[PDB]
Amino acid sequence: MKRTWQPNRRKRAKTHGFRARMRTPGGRKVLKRRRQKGRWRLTPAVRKR
Amino acid sequence: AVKKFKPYTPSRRFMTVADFSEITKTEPEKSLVKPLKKTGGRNNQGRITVRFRGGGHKRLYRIIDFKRWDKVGIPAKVAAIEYDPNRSARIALLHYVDGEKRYIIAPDGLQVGQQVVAGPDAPIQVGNALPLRFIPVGTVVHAVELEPKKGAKLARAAGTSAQIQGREGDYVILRLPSGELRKVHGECYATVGAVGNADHKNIVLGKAGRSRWLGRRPHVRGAAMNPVDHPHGGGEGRAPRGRPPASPWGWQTKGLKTRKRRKPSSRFIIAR
RNA sequence: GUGGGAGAGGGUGGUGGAAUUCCCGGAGUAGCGGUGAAAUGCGCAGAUACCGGGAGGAACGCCGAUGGCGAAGGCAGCCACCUGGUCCACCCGUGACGCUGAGGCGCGAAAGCGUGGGGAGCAAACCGGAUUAGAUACCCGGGUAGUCCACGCCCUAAACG
RNA sequence: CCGAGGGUAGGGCCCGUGACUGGGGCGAAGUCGUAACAAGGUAGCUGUACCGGAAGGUGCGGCUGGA
RNA sequence: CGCGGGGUGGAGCAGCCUGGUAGCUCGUCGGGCUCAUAACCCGAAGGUCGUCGGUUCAAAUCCGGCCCCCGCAACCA
RNA sequence: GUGGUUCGUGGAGCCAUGGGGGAAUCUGGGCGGACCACCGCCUAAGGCUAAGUACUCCGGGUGACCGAUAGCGCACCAGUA
RNA sequence: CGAGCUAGCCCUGGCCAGGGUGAAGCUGGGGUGAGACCCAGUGGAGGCCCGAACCGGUGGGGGAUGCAAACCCCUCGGAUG
RNA sequence: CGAAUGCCGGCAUGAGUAACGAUAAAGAGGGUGAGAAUCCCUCUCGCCGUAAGCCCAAGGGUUCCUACGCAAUGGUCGUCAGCGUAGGGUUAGGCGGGACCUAAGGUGAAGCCGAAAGGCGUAGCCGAAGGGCAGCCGGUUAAUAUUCCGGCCCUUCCCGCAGGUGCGAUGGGGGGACGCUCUAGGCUAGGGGGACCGGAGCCAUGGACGAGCCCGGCCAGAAGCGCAGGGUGGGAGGUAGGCAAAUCCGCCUCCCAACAAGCUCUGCGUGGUGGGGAAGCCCGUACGGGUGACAACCCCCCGAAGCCAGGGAGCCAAGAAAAGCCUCUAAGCACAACCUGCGGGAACCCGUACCGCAAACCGACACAGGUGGGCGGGUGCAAGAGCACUCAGGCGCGCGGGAGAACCCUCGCCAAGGAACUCUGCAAGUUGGCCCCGUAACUUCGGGAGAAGGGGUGCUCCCUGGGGUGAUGAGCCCCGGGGAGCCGCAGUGAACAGGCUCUGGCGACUGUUUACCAAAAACACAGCUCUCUGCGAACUCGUAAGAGGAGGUAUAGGGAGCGACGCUUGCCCGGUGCCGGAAGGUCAAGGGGAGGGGUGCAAGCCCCGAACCGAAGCCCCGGUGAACGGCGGCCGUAACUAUAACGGUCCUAAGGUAGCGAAAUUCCUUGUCGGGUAAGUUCCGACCUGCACGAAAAGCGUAACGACCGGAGCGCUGUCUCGGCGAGGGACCCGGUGAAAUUGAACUGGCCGUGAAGAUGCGGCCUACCCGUGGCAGGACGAAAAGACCCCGUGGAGCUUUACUGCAGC
């Protein structure tokens, strides 16, 4: 039947986006750590135009 | 009135509709004086505070005039009488001679063509509005104010009305659609007559949908749910509560009074 | 027809005083209610009795009759509008147009039923208190429908002269 | 083609029978009470309504076949 | 089988738990009123207390054994 | 009414303080564990002040520390696949 | 950290072949004092019926290291709400 | 290190076993090649064809196209590829988004709140398949085109000239601008027919040179018309409203229209012109090209769900906003500006390949699963997106060849009986579409109803009645009615297409639910009642601010229960609850201080502390059951027995009424009596001894409604006696690829004993050459899961109250 992953570019940047994470105190920390851990990608790689 | 139906479908037998004869060939509302976008929504910021709402026909707000000392002395002619989805009372639209249009909740009687007005002057006739003092003790009246300049608030439901009782200082005793004798200030307007369309209390919704149309989702009894989400809940084949009847949140609901005790509004009240 | 006459005939609107019950205040105590007698109950948490003030509903004392009106059932404070019947006089108009009335249609106390209002007093049922051998009764204190209004059904009667 | 009748299916009336049931009529000396007739010891009678072992009682209105 | 409750004049109930004292309503018997019966009035009679044991000076009453009676439990499989 | 102190209400002081009352300027105030006397110590309700002290992303040294299933997860283009 | 599955609400758009059945209201006639009402004709009402898409998930079989961590076949519910 | 269902890695085992992913299907000749069932070509055959065919969007991100290649990827092969290497490939003022607008909702100056982080928040900003807005038809490439080019037609800016007018706002108005079902008239898309036009061809096989067969007969295109159709009154006075101002808007009052007459605004035709252009045939493709061609480009009919569009009619639930657009004026400026023509000039940024109901998206896979929108031809069946065949177009689902066992899946058929099968007609059949007959109880007058039960249904000729498009006709297209006749076993001849009935229970009904074992008698539901709430409402979320409630106001809103409708809902307020009681009893801080205590030499300072005054709360006094609840026992009695209308006594707060009753409630129980039956622990009707119904956790009913749950008939039948035959896909044999749970090691026989009590393994005897293959499942206390029942642990959570102890809240 229908599954749980229904990709959607908008929803994805809108939710796990970078400006998205900067906006909140908890998300900013999410960035810190990922930066502090090394992670090549701080946030998901949404795309297209 | 109240239209009836032959049983050509169970439900549309007991079903009963209103009679919109009193509706002056109007229907399409009046831009300008209303309508405004009406933000429908069953909960506040986030959560749902009143339960069981949502869904139900889209609606446009008819921005009515609920404080008439706006036009003291300026007479206006009642133009139409139309339907208002936001209330039980039908409403009348009227053109002042000032050239301004505005709606008023329509009183029983008031016919299209009639002239109506407000102010200390104003003749005591259906439609006219005046400060409570200047109104004849005993006359009935609707659309009362509670405090000078704050707008109408009592007897505005379909065909409801309040009767003046006496005077007493800068105050005048009323008798609200509920039976409470209240002391209102003299300077509160109150347009004369009863609200009209009193057959409203007689409409037999009819089916399940009918309720759904007016935006009210099904209502489930506490008795149906479990202990986890309401007092009356569990365990075997139904049950008799098992304790003093209570609400989802738990306070008694078969008798417990609510008005907050030490309210300042107490002293101006006298009844039930 | 013309011209008048009496009447609680009918409907709808509006209003007036008497008394009851409750409410508030005054003042005022040790009992009031009720019966054949009492008991329940009511009262020092201020009763009963009295005065002032306010709400609400129902019913209209004297006139009032052994009277009147209505086809009947029935109709009783006052005012107004709409309305039917009914008698008198004048002997003008019509010109036999008259009577009864199977069915039909309509009205139709009361209780009762529907929906909505209203609810002072009364009061089926019902709770008490007496009475009795026992009382689901007659007697007493409570008291719900009902009683009253709108509209809709119900068509009964010792509807009797 | 029609057509006596034969088979199918569904209706209408009447007749008989049926556990138990409902009241009834009748049956010399069974039980409980005492409703009515004298003011029947609550005048009765009534239509309706609720109630009660039973008679019956009560309400609302009516009637004289009572005062 | 197990839990606890109960056997009292003819009927239905008290009386114990703080042992010595059996009480009430009805019914039954005798007498009255009435023509007579009921009602009502006046008096009177009747109880090995389920039984076999002992506990104490003394048991309806305290304690164990059986005879019926009533109610409650007989769950997980 | 509470916190801090070894201090959990204890005879419970001191140091801080939300609440209410509400001063004094040296013959003025706080403390020495209820309180009082005596004898003493200090001078609150404004602020700053290096040094010794902590830490190791980075650089260096040295190991009765590992030696590729160990040693950091990674000796290798790993915080990758 | 998650309402891209799922539940609910909000704003905004989209979708439902083709058949049945015949509501009220109209129009004519009948009726009466005027009515109630009765007939026709029109009319197209409905949490209306049949039934595709679509939305489901009744009964049985198969599938059960599957085609599939919810499947398939037969059948069945609803489908202007 | 020998064990931890231990950790990591490696390799065995089952095993050449099961599988190789749809039962829509393949056969052959000819190329290429080291190697072809699998690649390329051709011929033949089968599948889809409201798609398995085309077009978008989302997602995907190089998968598109060429050349060169098979190591691996492909469930086999592979020269093929969605694969590996390389290069090429996406072109926009008009399509889509943005330098336009606004909705929910974000964000957010002013402000408001919160220990901080942070929370709210009218303006404004953001915010999109919603509003606004300017491109159609063809051609070319190996790959892109509404993008390039070709033809025709537009949009804005900016700059000039020609003039018109007081121009002029982020401000005022107008408009933009709206529901649902049903529809009118005219159109186009789409389709059918053609004796007419235009076409390579073709006379087969017995007949046919024929109005013969086959193939095709348009597309776009401004102004100008013409045909539809939408919008709209025109003047003038007065004007206090439209938050400054208006000449505009509104509101009055006099004239003229009421008509679409007249302006406009779209759709449709017609249109200068531009372009396309079948079959067959020749070729060479991996495909396209050439000819057919000066191709024709004609007339009728069907016909939209689309267009005119802001069309109309009806209805109740009463149906976005802002901007563009017009209009109106203000500060300002009126040598500005703005409006109308004509020219020139200027016009950025992003997307375009390809997949796209799928091998390129979501499912670890080239996964029978899922995935919004548009097109979806023809014939026939009453209609239809249905069904069957088929256009166009695309597939034969990436392992094959045999054989023709059991058994499995799926499918067909049956003698005679027919439910005897069985928990149960479960499953399977029967019926089946349309038309016309003809339809019962009961009923809430609708219904039940497709009741039930029947006949008709194909072709041929003859006669005859309607329409519609055309003129009142021909044709073409729809409905008909009658009458003769013909052929079959059979005429909705193939596909799609109810089995029917009686009866009871349960619930009113449509609806809802346990995604993934429960679709119900559960939930919801209109309706019924109680109760709270006067408005800064009650109530709920939040610490607050604030928000919902509600821009609502007692015919309104919150809670609770019952659950349409009919008939009805009895007694108990003693307890618990809530409601009412300005009296009393008790009651904390505090107020009050009689009095006592510690120090001082004293003033003092410092502690205790009885009266008394002190709230709610409880106690106390009443109301109240559609509030929490409850609603008896033991005797006796009637002139046959029997039974008890009557009585007696005890305890209650009061002593369950009507109605129902062996029940969804009944233990004893298959109670007992009746019915159905050959026989009936079920069913149905009765009785009442109701273990243990009973009145809003409602009582007894009720037409209708049901994938609910029993009982019964008729019909039909492989369910069965009791099986048999047949088909296909596996099973089996061959080639290719080739797993898995499990596994102390194995050289793993029967009885009878014994053993921790169920022995291949010990004892005694009996039996038994070695190794495979198909099968059956009794055993290996067979696999699977540290048993989910149970008990244990002073283990864990979920839930309740008059458990304890707090907290919110009041």
Ligand SMILES: NC[C@@H]1O[C@H](O[C@H]2[C@@H](O)[C@H](O[C@@H]3[C@@H](O)[C@H](N)C[C@H](N)[C@H]3O[C@H]3O[C@H](CO)[C@@H](O)[C@H](O)[C@H]3N)O[C@@H]2CO)[C@H](N)[C@@H](O)[C@@H]1O
């Ligand atoms: N025909 C009698 C009807 O029924 C009732 O009457 C019936 C009863 O009331 C009546 O019962 C009477 C009773 O009143 C009286 N107090 C006691 C008497 N023993 C009974 O008598 C009855 O029973 C006996 C035998 O048992 C018979 O022989 C006698 O005839 C009979 N009437 O017996 C009658 C039937 O037999 C009505 N009261 C009466 O109005 C009506 O007419």
Ligand SMILES: [Mg+2]
């Ligand atoms: Mg607006």
Ligand SMILES: [Mg+2]
């Ligand atoms: Mg919130």
Ligand SMILES: [Mg+2]
């Ligand atoms: Mg938020």
Ligand SMILES: [Mg+2]
């Ligand atoms: Mg009502």
Ligand SMILES: [Mg+2]
């Ligand atoms: Mg509910």
Ligand SMILES: [Mg+2]
């Ligand atoms: Mg539940």
Ligand SMILES: [Mg+2]
């Ligand atoms: Mg929850």
Ligand SMILES: [Mg+2]
């Ligand atoms: Mg709870």
Ligand SMILES: [Mg+2]
């Ligand atoms: Mg239960």
Ligand SMILES: [Mg+2]
């Ligand atoms: Mg409960």
Ligand SMILES: [Mg+2]
């Ligand atoms: Mg009279």
Ligand SMILES: [Mg+2]
């Ligand atoms: Mg004369």
Ligand SMILES: [Mg+2]
């Ligand atoms: Mg007559």
Ligand SMILES: [Mg+2]
């Ligand atoms: Mg009457």
Ligand SMILES: [Mg+2]
């Ligand atoms: Mg009456």
